[PDB]
Amino acid sequence: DAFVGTWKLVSSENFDDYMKELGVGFATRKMGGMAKPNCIISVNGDVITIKTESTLKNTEISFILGQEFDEVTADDRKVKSTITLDGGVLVQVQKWDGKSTTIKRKREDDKLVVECVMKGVTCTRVYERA
Numbered sequence: 001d002a003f004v005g006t007w008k009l010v011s012s013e014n015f016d017d018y019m020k021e022l023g024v025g026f027a028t029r030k031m032g033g034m035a036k037p038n039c040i041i042s043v044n045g046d047v048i049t050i051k052t053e054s055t056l057k058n059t060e061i062s063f064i065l066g067q068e069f070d071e072v073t074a075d076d077r078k079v080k081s082t083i084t085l086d087g088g089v090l091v092q093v094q095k096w097d098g099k100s101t102t103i104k105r106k107r108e109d110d111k112l113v114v115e116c117v118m119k120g121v122t123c124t125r126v127y128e129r130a
């Protein structure tokens with residue numbers, strides 16, 4: 001839709017702090033921090049696929065909106081994830097061990113903007129079309 005495409009990371013603010021609040025260790029933070037992934041979003045009927053590709057680590061999720069699914073995150077958390085579409089924003093919550101984080105993906109001009117919150121920490125990542 002507005003989201004379908006191949007997107008390349010162009011900016012990131014507060015991602016180290018976000019990863020620290022998730023409990024990610026120093027080695028993984030160091031690798032994730034200077035990664036510049038691509039994010040490839042596609043849709044086939046009810047099923048949306050988001051692939052994240054980078055030199056040291058790739059991930060993929062496929063989901064139906066509103067249907068919880070199991071996910072292994074890039075930092076190896078085992079989470080229960082739910083994604084909905086709200087006012088044109090893809091809103092993802094991850095739940096594990098009584099904790100949660102939310103990841104909002106939105107389209108703004110030429111940007112795919114990703115806002116990630118864990119407790120008091122807010123990270124903003126911007127992708128542009130490859």
Ligand SMILES: O=C(O)[C@H]1CCCC[C@H]1COc1ccc(Cl)c(Cl)c1
Nearest residue numbers: 032035052054057058059074103125
């Ligand atoms: O920008 C995003 O898509 C956000 C979304 C939420 C998880 C956190 C980010 C994913 O972050 C990384 C960062 C580095 C690597 Cl190498 C990989 Cl596979 C994922």
